Amino acid sequence: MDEKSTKIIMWLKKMFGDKPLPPYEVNTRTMEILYQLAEWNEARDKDLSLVTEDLKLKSAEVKAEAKYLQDLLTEGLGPSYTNLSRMGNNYLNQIVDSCLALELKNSSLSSYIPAVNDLSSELVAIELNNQEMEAELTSLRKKLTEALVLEKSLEQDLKKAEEQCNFEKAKV
Amino acid sequence: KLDSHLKELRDFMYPEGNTLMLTTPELSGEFHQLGSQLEKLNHITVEILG
Amino acid sequence: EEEVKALQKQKNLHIRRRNKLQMVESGNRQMCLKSKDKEEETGRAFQEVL
Amino acid sequence: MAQTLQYVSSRLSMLQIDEEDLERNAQFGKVLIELCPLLGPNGGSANLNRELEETRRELLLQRKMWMRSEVIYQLVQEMLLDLQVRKLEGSLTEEERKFQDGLQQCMLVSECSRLLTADSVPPSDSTSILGLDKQDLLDLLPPNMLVLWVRDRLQKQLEEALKKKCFTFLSFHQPETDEEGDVLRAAKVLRLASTLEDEKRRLQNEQEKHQEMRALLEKQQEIYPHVLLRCLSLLRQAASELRLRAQSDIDRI
Amino acid sequence: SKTQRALQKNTNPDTDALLKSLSDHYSLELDEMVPKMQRLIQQCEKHQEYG
């Protein structure tokens, strides 16, 4: 028990920082819930720290590749590729923003086509699962309500039956 | 299983659906009929003694 | 009935998208056959340079 | 108490907290409410979640810059492929053929120039591949008049190809737009990115609704067997104590 | 596991054993008690004639 308690007090000090720890009822159940929360938060914070440091690396690599492509296009095509019309630049922005929304590798039709299909299929599959689950939840609520009404009827009929049986016992 | 056991025990305890059956209906009828016949026999006995 | 309508709409969408994918794929396959002839032409030009 | 439970379960959906746990431990309930802003909705620390969202925004900015150049490069590749297929069909004009060969040569020379250039190494010590310098490749470039003409003609073809690629994207997402005129298609292209971003947000909201309904279903599945057991207990008492015993003894006497 | 522990606390008697006890009791009243009452009814009727 003492190791879990020390881990919780350490974790709570780390989370609250300089704020005074609020008093709470220290029992087996509250310490178990706090212990699970502390383990889950430590695991999640490790995973988040690894993702954040990879995103920093990826931001530097993508910036390096962006510069390479810009300079390649400037050497090959000249400064002409940046001088698009207001509509040419709007079409360019919509391809870019569509590919960013879908988190694509690149702007190819081979990347765009599957991503639009997967998004459409996941949306309908989750909407269907939500309708099925809302029907189960409505059905189970009806059964639960009928069972609660039955519980109340049985309580009353049992009490009437006990009163009637006590009256007939006295007559017997 | 809980729904089945609840339904079977309820159907046995509530054969007319609405009333808790404490006494066998056949036996309840015979009690009423014997009660009535014994009340008639008591009347005849009181009349003859009078 | 809304679910049947939604699935009919999704079926019609998949039929249209598959037809489009088959058009893209048929155009691409014709481009790829000609790009193989191009790979043989550039392979010949590469042998000429060798 | 129910509002406190609902707030904590919405933010800490991994915590099994019962209403009895908060009723017996009212100060513990305050600690969980104070932890809910220090913990993100994902169970990770709120500071680490802000740093994650800042690092995501920076990546998204660099990715947007990369994607603008990538789209143009891939359009030039796709255009060169389409012109090269039409050249094998014999369906190119002499002018398109000069443009395709001039554009392909300008791109190949610039790509190969970048394979030779260690731009940052002082020129005395860098062994070049095949002993070739950037100057040896510049001689394989088309005549300067042809390069300028390719660059001027390219700007129009790049806008036409951008319009075509946007129209392909729209027509795969919304295949009903193929029967629509170019002006209506252009107006729908201008909303395509926002429509995909709204569809993705709708997916996230329905996944959250799914988790919330699943948690409510599981709570009702826990309560329902206990209600049935209480009803069975009352019926067993009526059967065993009243019918088989108390009423049976009354009827005998 | 909470539900199984609640089922184990409520199970003396078992539901099938209780239904059988209820059916056996119902049969005993029909075979023994009902024909005893009918004999007492017929005896009361004979005693009314003897009046």
Swiss-Prot record, chain C:
Highest taxon listed in the record's lineage: Eukaryota
Localization: Cytoplasm, Cytoskeleton, Microtubule organizing center, Centrosome; Cytoplasm, Cytoskeleton, Spindle
Coiled-coil regions, chain positions: 1-23
Family: Belongs to the HAUS3 family.
Biological role stated in the UniProt entry: Contributes to mitotic spindle assembly, maintenance of centrosome integrity and completion of cytokinesis as part of the HAUS augmin-like complex.
Membrane-spanning residues: none
Name listed for the protein in its UniProt record: HAUS augmin-like complex subunit 3
Encoding gene (name): haus3
Subunit note: Component of the HAUS augmin-like complex. The complex interacts with the gamma-tubulin ring complex and this interaction is required for spindle assembly.
Organism of provenance: Xenopus laevis
